[PDB]
Amino acid sequence: ANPTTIANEVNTISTIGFSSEVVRLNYLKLQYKFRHLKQTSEKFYTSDSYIGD
Amino acid sequence: LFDENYYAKAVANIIGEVKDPIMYKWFSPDQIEDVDLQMGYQKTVKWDAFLN
């Protein structure tokens, strides 16, 4: 509220309030799956230019 | 070879006087890559991924 004028005697004074805010950040873990050629089988697909089917 | 082929020796001596082509200015140093053949065809393969 508005400030209180200090004149003569007074007991009721205006107040200053305080507040707290909690801020939260969430995280998410995600995954992908992909197919590939086997290391031992790479020799059976290693062509001159390309190295995959 | 140079003691036998006077034409080859002359080509080797005169190759320096030839100026560089102007097409080099049109491309960046990384854009030009020499290959090894004279006549025929070559094939290039480009791989790209996507999410399903």
Determination technique for this entry: cryo-EM
Residues belonging to chain B: 52
Q: Give me the phi and psi of B17, to 5 degrees please.
A: -70, -15
CA B49 to CA A35: how far, in whole Å? 11
Task: Establish if A50 touches chain B: CB-CB under 8 angstroms.
Answer: yes
Structure resolution in Å? 2.7
Question: A1: Cβ–Cβ under 8 A, 6 or more apart, which residues?
Answer: A14, A15
For residues A20-39, b (16+ Cβ closer than 10 Å) or e, as one string? eeeeeeeeeeeeeeeeeeee
Task: Establish if A52 touches chain B: CB-CB under 8 angstroms.
Answer: yes
Nearest CA in chain B to A32: B51
Mutation to test the A interface, candidates B36, B45, B50, most A Cβ within 10 Å:
B45
